[PDB]
Amino acid sequence: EPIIDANGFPRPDANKYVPPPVPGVQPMNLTQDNAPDLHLLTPEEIKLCETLRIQPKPYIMIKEQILKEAVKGNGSLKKKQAKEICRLDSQKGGRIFDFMVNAGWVVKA
Amino acid sequence: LREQILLNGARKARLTELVKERMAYQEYQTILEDLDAQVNAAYLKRTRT
């Protein structure tokens, strides 16, 4: 906290959406030495990455493609549309899509 | 750091206003005491003799 506040008077004492754990998923700890771009992910999203066993950089790429596909079509996509785009297990694609819609960056058709 | 330096400068700035007046009192006292010794020491001789 500032010692002297904005008006120039010194201080008197100078001196969340929780996705369910998908069956058969073992969260892995994320470490600064392992995750290169960890220092950018928001706190609400870092929990998802651990719960889903996915590294940051792959996660950002998945975020981009889903965003591109949605914007091209007014932002509405079908559930199978999100599943195919992710190109991974059904639960993983379902969970990430459910997070995006709750966040508000997409809308389910 | 930039937040603390200004506060220190302000604090030191005020003290320099209080130190200067106290220096003057020292010079006035250091001459007053000398007179006190003479007037005090110039009467003991009367008792002595």
Automatic annotation (TrEMBL), chain A:
SWIRM domain ranges (all copies): 21-109
Protein localization: Nucleus
Domain of life: Eukaryota
Name under which the protein is recorded: Transcriptional adapter 2
Source organism of the structure: Chaetomium thermophilum (strain DSM 1495 / CBS 144.50 / IMI 039719)
Shown chain mapped onto the complete sequence: 391 to 519 of 519
Automatic annotation (TrEMBL), chain B:
Compartment(s) of residence: Nucleus
Top-rank taxon: Eukaryota
Protein family: Belongs to the NGG1 family.
Record-given protein name: Uncharacterized protein
Organism: Chaetomium thermophilum (strain DSM 1495 / CBS 144.50 / IMI 039719) (Thermochaetoides thermophila)
